[PDB]
């Protein structure tokens, strides 16, 4: 069964601050029988990236193993590879974007070996949405159907493009890989087109890793930061976006940040609103406020 008879409404919250940023987050199981979301929130990365921050939401499916592994190691795989480093001083925008892509493919490969030797009924997968923030840029990262959104100058400034099986580029890859999109799902089952894990959808002979039925390749969009106008970023899984629009959620959060500076509370309000609107899925939201976010 996919659903409980009564929703599990308990919320897990976390918050922190540093590098001029403040964040809050909320996680809730809701009407689902299992809780398969995971998240990463870190201010200050190692080895010379102390001024950098990384936030991410992982929406797992068919188990929580891939999501949990991603939340514990995706950041390392991203920053430790040669592409991210780009042997010189600090990584260029291109280094960061290539490093993120290499991170996704490498953690996926690594996870494939470990799910092979220790065989079992853990054929899970997880989408990922997040932001790697540097002193000069915000790097939106998307792999799946969760979504990240940036509010700048009281407006929706950017939001990621959900990876749906029926979108043209996805359907193209799926058909080239010998699959099909039926009832909006890859081969009629998985309603996800990009994700880490889901190795059963990655065994197509003659096709590279980014050409499989399900792809681990992330979409990375760099945004030069604006100390004056950047207000906040919302990262949330489709349990939130399925029931609230970009403009609506942005306006809701911007309004709440005029009443309170409690980011966990604002995240709880977002989650509860979506639950009351009828969302029957797991829900995870991270709210990262910049120095010039709406103030209470």
């Amino acid at each position: 069964g996919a659903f409980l008879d009564k929703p599990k409404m308990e919320k897990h919250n976390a918050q922190g601050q540093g590098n001029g940023l403040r964040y809050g987050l909320s996680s809730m199981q809701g009407w689902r029988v299992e809780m398969e979301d995971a998240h990463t929130a870190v201010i200050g990365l190692p080895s010379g990236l102390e001024s950098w921050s990384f936030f991410a939401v992982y929406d797992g499916h068919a188990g929580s193993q891939v999501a949990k592994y991603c939340c514990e190691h995706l950041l390392d795989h991203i920053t430790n590879n040669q592409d991210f480093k780009g042997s010189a001083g600090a990584p260029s925008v291109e280094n960061v974007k290539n490093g993120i892509r290499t991170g996704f493919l490498e953690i996926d490969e690594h996870m494939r070996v470990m799910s092979e030797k220790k065989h079992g009924a853990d054929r899970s997968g997880s989408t990922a949405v997040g932001v790697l923030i540097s002193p000069q840029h915000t790097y939106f990262i998307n792999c799946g159907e969760s979504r990240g959104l940036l509010c700048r100058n009281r407006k929706v400034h950017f939001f990621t493009q959900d990876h749906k099986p029926s979108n043209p580029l996805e359907k193209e890859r799926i058909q080239n890989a010998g699959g099909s999109v039926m009832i909006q799902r890859v081969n009629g089952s998985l309603a996800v087109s990009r994700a880490l894990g889901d190795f059963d959808y990655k065994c197509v002979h003659g096709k590279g890793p980014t050409e499989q039925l399900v792809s681990p390749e992330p979409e990375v969009h760099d945004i030069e930061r604006s100390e004056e106008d950047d207000q906040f970023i919302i990262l949330a899984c489709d349990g939130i976006w399925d029931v609230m629009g970009n403009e609506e959620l942005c306006d809701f959060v911007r309004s709440r940040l005029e009443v309170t500076d409690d980011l966990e509370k604002v995240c709880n309000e977002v989650v509860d609103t979506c639950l009351y609107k009828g969302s029957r899925d797991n829900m995870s939201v991270i709210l990262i406020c910049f120095p010039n976010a709406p103030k209470v």
Partner: peptide, 6 residues
């Protein structure tokens, strides 16, 4: 949902 269809 991701796998459950209904």
């Amino acid at each position: 949902m991701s796998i459950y269809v209904a």
